[PDB]
Amino acid sequence: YKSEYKMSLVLGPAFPWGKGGEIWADLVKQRTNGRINIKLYPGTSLVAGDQTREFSAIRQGVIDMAVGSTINWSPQVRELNLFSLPFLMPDYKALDALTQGEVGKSIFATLEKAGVVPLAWGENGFREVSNSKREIRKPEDLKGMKLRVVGSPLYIETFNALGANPTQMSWADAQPAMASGAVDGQENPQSVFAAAKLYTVGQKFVTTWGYVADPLIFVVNKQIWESWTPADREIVKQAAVDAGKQEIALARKGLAEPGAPAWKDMEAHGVKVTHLTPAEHDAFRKATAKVYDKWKKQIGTDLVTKAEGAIAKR
Ligand SMILES: CC(=O)[C@](C)(O)C(=O)O
Numbered sequence: 001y002k003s004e005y006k007m008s009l010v011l012g013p014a015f016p017w018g019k020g021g022e023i024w025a026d027l028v029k030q031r032t033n034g035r036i037n038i039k040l041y042p043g044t045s046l047v048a049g050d051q052t053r054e055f056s057a058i059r060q061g062v063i064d065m066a067v068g069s070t071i072n073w074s075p076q077v078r079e080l081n082l083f084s085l086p087f088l089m090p091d092y093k094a095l096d097a098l099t100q101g102e103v104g105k106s107i108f109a110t111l112e113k114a115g116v117v118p119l120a121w122g123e124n125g126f127r128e129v130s131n132s133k134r135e136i137r138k139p140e141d142l143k144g145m146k147l148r149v150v151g152s153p154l155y156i157e158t159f160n161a162l163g164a165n166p167t168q169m170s171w172a173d174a175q176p177a178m179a180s181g182a183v184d185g186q187e188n189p190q191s192v193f194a195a196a197k198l199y200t201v202g203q204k205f206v207t208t209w210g211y212v213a214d215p216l217i218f219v220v221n222k223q224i225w226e227s228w229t230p231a232d233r234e235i236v237k238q239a240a241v242d243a244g245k246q247e248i249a250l251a252r253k254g255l256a257e258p259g260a261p262a263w264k265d266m267e268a269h270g271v272k273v274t275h276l277t278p279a280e281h282d283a284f285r286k287a288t289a290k291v292y293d294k295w296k297k298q299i300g301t302d303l304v305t306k307a308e309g310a311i312a313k314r
C-alpha cells in the first residue's frame, strides 16, 4: 500500500462537505489500525482548482479518492445532470428518494463502469440564489444579472432562460469576482453561504427558491480500490457510509425544518432573505421547463422519469 493516499475536496473542513471528508479519513485510519493513511487536498489543488476536471483526475489516478459534488463531475458523467434539472426536487424527502432509491443505484452503476468506485452519498444542498443588487421574486428580476455558476453548460442554459448573464468559474475564481463586483451574485447551499461568509462579499439578497440541490458522492479510484484487500475495501466503504450520514446531518443543520433558523441566522448579518409564494415558485418552474425537457432527453429520459416517479411517491 501507498504510504499516503490523496483525497480531493473542493471545500475544506470549514464546510460540511470538507468535514465529511475529514471524518471519512479519520475513520479509515482508525479502523485499519493506521494502515490506510489519507491526506486531504482541499481547494481542488490536485487539479489546480479546476474542479470541473476533477473526475478525470480521479479516473486517471492523479487523485486516489474524493468527496465530490455531482455538479463538478457532470461534464464527464451526463447522468449527474439529473440533480441539476431546474425544479425537479421540492424538498429533502425528494432528494433522499433519489439517492436512496433506484435512481441513486443507477447512477452508482454508471460511475462504477466509468472506473470510479462509488461508496456513499453526502450533501452540499439546495442551491439558493444570492446577489448584491436587488430582491429576486420572479424571473424578470434576474434580467441582465451577472451570476456566477460552475462550468457545467446546463447552468448556463437555466440562467439564460431566466434572462440573466451567467458566467462560469471555479469556486476559487468566484471569490475575487464577488469581492470586486465583477459578478453580481452566485448560487449555493446555505451552509456554503454561511461558512464562506458570502454576505462579506456583497451577497446581501438571497431567495430560497430551492431550484436544484447537489448531493455529494464518496468515491475511490478503481485501481486504488482493487489494490486494497477485500477486507479493507469493506472498512473504507463502511467508513464512507458513516461519514456520509454524519455529513448530511451537518449539511441540513437548521434547514430541513419548518422555520429554517439557519437562514434567520444570515438575516442577522444583514441579509434580506426572500421566500417565494407557491405561485412565484411555479412561475420559475414554468420559465425553466424547456431547459428541463431538453436536458431530460440528454440525461436519459427513462432515468429522469424514474426520478419523477420516486419523488411523486415519496
Ligand atoms: C459545486 C461546488 O463545488 C461549489 C463549492 O458548491 C461551488 O463551486 O459553488
Ligand SMILES: [Cl-]
Pocket: 011, 012, 013, 014, 015, 018, 042
Ligand atoms: Cl476550509
Ligand SMILES: [Cl-]
Pocket: 091, 092, 093, 094, 256
Ligand atoms: Cl423534506
